[PDB]
Amino acid sequence: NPLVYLDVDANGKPLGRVVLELKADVVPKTAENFRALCTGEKGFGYKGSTFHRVIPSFMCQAGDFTNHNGTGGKSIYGSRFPDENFTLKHVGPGVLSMANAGPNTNGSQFFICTIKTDWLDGKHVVFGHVIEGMDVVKKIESFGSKSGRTSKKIVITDCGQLS
């Protein structure tokens, strides 16, 4: 399975690196979309964009590199893409899953859970998990709020593929 990284800062101060394993063995199409958006190999992707909605005891959401507010993004497939499967569950902190606006509306937005979000099982496609840097995710979470507005600007300053 591919390993990818997000290097994250808050108001220009590095928080550290999040390493994500992408479950290409279970959701290859969804994993590949995220992988390519981390490398930027199609000319666009996550680098320089933000965690735009962060809610403590819920999740940290990112990937809206077009509108920066939870309405945008772009997949590698030329359109919103179907939910590949709902095999993997939102079992706990560190789960990596696709944001959406209903069934079969995957783009580029994604989230990292900070709790078991079992009420999202069967609604959002889980496709990976944090293997290093959960403490960075907890730091991101600490800048969240009830509304999801962040108290510092949380930026993916670099991202890419490790292996």
Strands 95-98, 110-113: pairing kind: antiparallel
Say how far apart CA 39 and CA 161 lie, in whole Å.
6
Q: Nearest Cα to 80, choosing from 13, 125, 143, 15?
A: 125
Tell me which method was used to determine the 3D structure.
Answer: X-ray
Strands 59-62, 3-10: pairing kind: unpaired
Q: Nearest Cα to 51, choosing from 112, 131, 124, 121?
A: 112
Active-site choice (6, 20, 37, 61): 61
Please confirm, yes or no, whether 124 is among the known catalytic residues.
Answer: yes
Please confirm, yes or no, whether 111 is among the known catalytic residues.
Answer: yes
Per-domain residue ranges for the chain?
A: 1-163
Inter-residue contact 51 to 76 (CB < 8 Å): no
Say how far apart CA 72 and CA 63 lie, in whole Å.
8
| Residue 150 tokens, joined | 């962040």
Active-site choice (109, 120, 127, 143): 120
Please confirm, yes or no, whether 120 is among the known catalytic residues.
Answer: yes
Please confirm, yes or no, whether 35 is among the known catalytic residues.
Answer: no
| Residue 91 tokens, joined | 């079992």
Active-site choice (52, 90, 124, 129): 124
The kind and range of the H/E element at 139 are: helix 134-142
Active-site choice (34, 58, 110, 143): 58
Alpha helices in 3-128 (DSSP H): 28-39
Say how far apart CA 46 and CA 34 lie, in whole Å.
9
| Residue 78 tokens, joined | 């030329």
Please confirm, yes or no, whether 100 is among the known catalytic residues.
Answer: yes
Please confirm, yes or no, whether 161 is among the known catalytic residues.
Answer: no
Given resolution (angstroms): 1.1
Active-site choice (65, 111, 127, 143): 111
What are the b/e assignments for 77-109, b being 16+ CB within 10 Å?
eeeebebbeeebebeebbbbbbbbeeeeebbbb
